[PDB]
Design a protein around this nucleic acid. Structure first.
Lengths: 116, 158, 226, 125
RNA sequence: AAAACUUUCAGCAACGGAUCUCUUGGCUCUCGCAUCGAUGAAGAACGCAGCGAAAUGCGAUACGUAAUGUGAAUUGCAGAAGAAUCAUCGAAUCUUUGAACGCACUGCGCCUUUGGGACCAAAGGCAUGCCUGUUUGAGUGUCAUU
RNA sequence: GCGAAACCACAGCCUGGGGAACGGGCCAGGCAA
RNA sequence: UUGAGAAGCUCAGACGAGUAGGCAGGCGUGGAGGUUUGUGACGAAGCCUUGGGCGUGAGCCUGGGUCGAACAGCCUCUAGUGCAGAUCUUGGUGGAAGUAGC
RNA sequence: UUUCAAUGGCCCGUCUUGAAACACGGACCAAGGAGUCUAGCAUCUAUGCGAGUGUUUGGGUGAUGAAAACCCAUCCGCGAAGGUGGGAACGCCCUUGUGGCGUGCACCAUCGAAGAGCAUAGCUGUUGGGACCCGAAAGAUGGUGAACCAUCUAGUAGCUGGUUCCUGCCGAAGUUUCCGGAUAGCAGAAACUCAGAUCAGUUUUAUGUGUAAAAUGAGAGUU
RNA sequence: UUGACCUCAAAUCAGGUAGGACUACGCGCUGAACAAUAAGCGCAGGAAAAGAAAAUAACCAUGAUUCCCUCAGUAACGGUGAAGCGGGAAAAGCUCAAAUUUGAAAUCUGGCAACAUUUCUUUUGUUGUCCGAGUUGUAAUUUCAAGAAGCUGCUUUGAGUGUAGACGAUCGGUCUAAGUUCCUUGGAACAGGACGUCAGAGAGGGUGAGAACCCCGUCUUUGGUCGAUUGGAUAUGCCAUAUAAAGCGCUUUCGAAGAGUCGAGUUGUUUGCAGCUCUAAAUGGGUGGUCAUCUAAAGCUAAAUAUUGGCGAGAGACCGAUAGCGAACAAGUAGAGUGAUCGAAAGAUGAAAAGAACUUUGAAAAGAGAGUUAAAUAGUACGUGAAAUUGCUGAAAGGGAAGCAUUGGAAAUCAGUCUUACCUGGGUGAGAUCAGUAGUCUCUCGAGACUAUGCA
């Protein structure tokens, strides 16, 4: 049982081509969703900062975005992560606020029945 | 090699060919017509998003971005938008305003049933004690609450 | 490779040591070795002797390194490139490569490897506006960007001294893509050009200078009589 | 140089295509040039051969001698020319074959389909 | 000692099929795509060409028809002049068999319909399990029920 | 007239001695047509 | 005095068996990038030949005869690279033998 | 070139055996035909960088094959954690030379208590992997009509037979000693320090055959 | 009794669906050698499986799964041999059971009727009615991330039908530059010389030898054009059953949570899993370190990943007819075997068949003349035609070998031949790099190439 990496330049170009069709389908929105900033859970890397999965419910409510719409404007949700330190709430709320600063939202046509 | 591959190589039937291989050609843009018009057909999406004033990824680039030329107390605060660095972003933003401008009439009128429904309540229980008029049941057939009765009162105005 | 299913001396047998696809095909070189080999490759394209000695027919080229202005990047027609090449007297290279188009020797040509010929001049540009589609059909003339110079194109066959025809915009970027022995290339991070074992590479000047020839002892005969 | 990945550059695959081609693909492989004055009259370079087309042989032992095309022998890529023959042993005539890219078309057989083909390729009569 | 015979070397002719050249083949890697069958698949057998030895192709509409094109050839001959041992292809055709299906495995049937010129023939179906439903009847049912 | 297989380094006078068989080749010999 | 392929040229002396084994320089084959502005229907490759040469040698260059479409020298890259044996694999062919014999 | 004349020369390879004797293998010719591919380790050398080092998981990019080249983000791996004399080299001289006066590297003696790697390529070595090639009854699974077939299988070997071009240099040991071995020894290969220094399958002189101190030669000793 | 409801059956009762094939990748059961190994069996897809924590961890804590890199040949075990961490690729979340709609089974298949609709007269729907299913529970609702209910006051909204254009995707046709000019050899010019042309086209192939310009193509094409077939958006027309339905907010009211399962003893298999013996709980239960985390026994789910098969495609420092597949061809073919199985050998005339008329001998087979061809030293036993091996001829040699080596001789045969040039003398005509000379061209005054003119 042996594996060869001859398709390594083939697979990389397939991935790039897979990104370009995604960009074609969804033009204005970025090819990647926003991710939060979290700290690795170990004494070795705890002083580091990296990306998370999504923004917890305290990070959404504090920033001012409901949890239902957040999934629609590209902000992802992590029901499992929680905020134990306020610096973790702060680094990710401002991460949301800077995102909503640059976020153009296209209006959608809405059904308007004659009566009500 | 295989029997199935080999019998149709000897036979006289033409091979079910497909001239599909178009290497190096990118996926043509559909969706937003504005960006399609300003989409260079040769540049990569990281290059075209940048040239168009759009972020391809709000998350950290995991690699080395091209250097073509030798380049020389707050939870209540809100970020006062981001001015567009390109015309094309302003084109996208301008359309957002106009689309919202058309969809401005979010107030709904009333149908006949709830129209006479609100008159019957209004002319009997005044116009201020909405809780009391929600407490009555002889005229409040559907047993609306005070909150929805006020909404109907506002909606009937215009 | 061969079919893994398919001794060595028997007819219709398993030849000794079945060729295996996991053989080592690609070879690692450190980057700072690759930049050194390519900075050296670029340096040796400015020395006319190493260009003739590689077979380049540049006996009438006005100047080495040969630099043109930015108007060559806006060419559109291959008549124009031949028009320019023939006024810089670099067309001897292309007329050499055309006459050198033999048919390969051996079982190579049975394998999509039909023809052979020399290498002509190399045109190093900075912007694509029609230069790449102008010169490309000219036999041998290869066009490669300044920022992605390739050792198989600056040192073909392993031999230094390919005839390069720079452009003005490309030549001016050379101070930024390679750097200097003191400063650093703006485009290649933290990269300094190599520093040599010696400064004056001409030894006959080192030896036959006064500062040495004034202190050496007497000279014997070059050939001693028997 | 080829750049499309839809085309191939293989001696083995291109020869497989050439000799594996059926007649409706062989009718384009057997084309012929046009005479210089006729080439510019219709502004077209080369047209596929056709029976009853007046042609002049340009290459080979039968260079120069003109005629028509009695029948196009597609399965071996040959043109049969009247009066361009060979004396067999038995005194009969085994007409030699000429390839379609050697002869030159002087007078075409004007069919309704040929006229449309001429005007289809930006030409005129 | 010459011939004969034996031996070496050269010329010439056989014998053999190496070498050299190639090459509609093999192998290897990458790449794109998602598609069999109870509406009878894969497989098998028997057939079929103006004549085929294999070989492909095709199914009594047999080396295929319809349709869309191309526009004059098939070719060892024949053969017609919308030709074509052509291409495309969305319509019909698609022998006996085979998961293989009436029972059997050659034969023997059954049922219904069509008809022939009451009987017979042809066609259609007549395989099992399971699922949803419809009708029919029955249980020693539970009742219901004056 | 039709016609093998086995076998095959190459051969084939011995006489003696040749130290290790040496005779099937080495040296002394005769023979050797 | 021209004798700097300084990896060159030149001078002097001694020395030379060889298994196991250690070290070094080369010759040859297929293909690969560079090159000879290389060779080739006025004859490539191959083949035979008591033609002529070169090298200690592996090997090489050439004449003649056949032959008919390709090939090579040089610098590097590379590997299914060099045969007298293996009761070696495959094909061919003899003696045995016109024998055993039918 | 064939042939003759005179002088000569026991069949080649293997194995055996000091050696042969041998016993093997060899009817002839052509072609095929056997240290290879790979991961790990250590060594030597070459190169790049050097308290650093390593782009190729991946991303960016590459219009002229785009599986190449070119570029770098976050990790990560491997590293990183004082006197005395003898001394290489140099200066000052100065009776110069001779030597002295010094400064003293690497290192070694002594008293003592101012990092050198990492990565790539090669060579040789070693361990695995089908493992230089060929050859031992198998066994097991599953089938077919005790037999037979197909695969697992590149099952197993200390053994057998074979393992392919040239020249040049060096060239043993063939066995002590303890104990299948670790030693040694011989041969090399490198690094050192000295010829004003040590030596010798040497010979004398002489003291009591040994030992110690003259000739004859050779540069000798270490790791 | 009637007749309901339950069961029981049958029918050629209508509408269905299952089987076999493939098997590279994939999910299970099962298995010996030599190891979840081959095999055996079972089931699938364009991927399969897995999957939104009864998951880590002890941190400033992370956050579905899958693959890659590292962690790491590490811990642990006793050589076997991981997992968090970290860094990358990709990302998307969800549906039930447990609630009384109870002020109204609000849900659904099937028959029939019209309305439509189409990759499509071959598809797929709606409306209406009737019948069944269903109260032993079908919809809405809610899934722990919560949420239900009352309240409040802000923000919201189509499972429609067209048309129109733009954009894309797949199939099809189509548009597309220049030598076959002169000279030589050849059967043939595609060659060699000469003069040209095109080039977004000097890839490759064909063509009577090496063709950018004769032919197919190639480049433009990361496209014009004409058709059809669809996809997600935009624009706009019409219709909207909204008395409705959501999000956030506030709660003096609430908050259901999957059993022969977990767990224990015990026995097999390879820690889990399986049988057997028992068999639970409700701040409980699992797992880690009195704490932290998680919330099993029900369900789905893209993409990242695999691919010796299938439908095609592009290439290669690959093999080049004893090779590369067993098969370049009649290749799993002939042929061998009762059978399962096994299984080959075999490529090349020439540009063109011009494949040898005809005469003649022979019963023919064939031979001899003769013909074709550039060539028959290409005659279908057909490219080149090596060695072994055999026949004929010429030569020398030839008392039980041969064989090779040295030295010659002889016969036979090749090597290689060269006075010719140099110097000097004169005459004769010249030219020039020379003119007690005149111009142009490219360079850097004078250095070249020349054009006149005279020949000192």
């Amino acid at each position: 049982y042996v594996k060869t990496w001859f398709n390594q330049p083939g697979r990389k170009l397939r991935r790039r081509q897979a990104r370009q069709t995604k960009a074609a389908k969804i033009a204005p929105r970025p090819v990647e969703a926003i991710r939060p900033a979290v700290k690795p859970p170990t004494i070795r890397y705890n002083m580091k900062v990296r990306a998370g999965r999504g923004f917890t419910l305290e990070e959404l409510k504090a920033a001012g975005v409901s949890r239902r719409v957040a999934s629609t404007i590209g902000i992802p949700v992590d029901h499992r992560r929680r905020n134990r330190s306020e610096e973790s709430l702060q680094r990710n709320v401002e991460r949301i606020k800077v995102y909503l600063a640059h976020l153009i939202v296209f209006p959608r046509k809405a059904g308007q029945p004659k009566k009500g | 090699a295989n029997p199935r591959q080999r019998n149709k190589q000897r036979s006289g039937k033409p091979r079910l060919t497909r001239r599909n291989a178009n290497k190096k050609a990118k996926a043509k843009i559909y969706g937003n017509f504005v960006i399609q018009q300003n989409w260079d057909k040769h540049a990569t999406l990281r290059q075209n998003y940048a040239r168009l004033g759009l972020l391809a990824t709000p998350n950290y680039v995991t690699g080395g971005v091209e250097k073509l030329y030798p380049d020389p107390d707050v939870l209540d605060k809100e970020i006062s938008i981001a001015p567009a660095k390109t015309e094309v972003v302003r084109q996208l933003e301008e359309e957002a305003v106009k689309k919202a401008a058309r969809q401005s009439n979010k107030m709904l009128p009333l149908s006949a049933f709830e129209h006479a429904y609100i008159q019957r309540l209004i002319n009997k229980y005044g116009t201020e004690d909405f809780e009391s008029m929600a407490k009555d049941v002889k005229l409040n057939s559907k047993l609306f609450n005070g909150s929805k009765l006020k909404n109907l009162y506002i909606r009937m105005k215009a | 490779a061969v079919s893994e299913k398919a001794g060595n001396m028997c007819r219709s047998g398993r030849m000794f040591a079945p060729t295996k696809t996991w053989r080592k095909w690609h070879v690692k070189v450190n980057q700072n070795e690759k930049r050194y080999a390519i900075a050296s490759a670029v340096a040796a394209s400015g020395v006319p002797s190493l260009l003739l000695a590689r077979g380049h027919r540049i006996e009438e080229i006005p100047e080495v390194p040969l630099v043109v202005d930015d108007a060559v990047q806006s060419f559109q027609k291959t008549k124009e490139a031949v028009a320019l090449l023939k006024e810089i007297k670099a067309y001897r290279d292309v007329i050499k490569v055309a006459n050198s188009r033999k048919l390969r020797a051996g079982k190579g040509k049975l394998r999509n490897r039909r023809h052979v010929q020399r290498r002509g001049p190399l045109v190093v540009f900075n912007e694509d506006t029609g230069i790449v589609k102008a010169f490309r059909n000219i036999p041998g003339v290869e066009i490669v960007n300044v920022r992605r110079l390739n050792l198989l194109q600056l040192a073909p066959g392993g031999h230094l001294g390919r005839f390069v025809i720079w452009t003005k915009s490309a030549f001016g970027l050379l101070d930024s893509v390679f750097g200097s022995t003191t400063e650093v290339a703006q485009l290649k991070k933290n990269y300094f050009l190599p520093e040599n074992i010696i400064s004056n590479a001409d030894v006959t000047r080192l030896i036959n200078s006064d500062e040495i020839q004034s202190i050496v002892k007497a000279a014997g005969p070059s050939r001693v009589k028997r | 140089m080829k750049f499309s990945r839809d085309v191939t550059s293989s001696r083995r695959k291109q020869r497989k295509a050439h000799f594996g081609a059926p007649s409706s693909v062989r009718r384009v492989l057997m084309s012929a040039p046009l005479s210089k004055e006729l080439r510019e009259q219709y502004k077209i370079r080369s047209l596929p051969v056709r029976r009853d087309d007046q042609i002049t042989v340009i290459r080979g032992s039968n260079k120069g001698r003109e005629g028509k095309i009695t029948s196009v022998y597609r399965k071996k890529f040959l043109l049969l020319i009247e009066r361009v023959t060979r004396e067999k042993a038995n005194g009969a005539s085994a007409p030699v074959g000429i390839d379609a890219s050697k002869v030159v078309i002087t007078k075409l057989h004007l069919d309704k389909d040929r006229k449309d083909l001429i005007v289809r390729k930006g030409g005129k009569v």
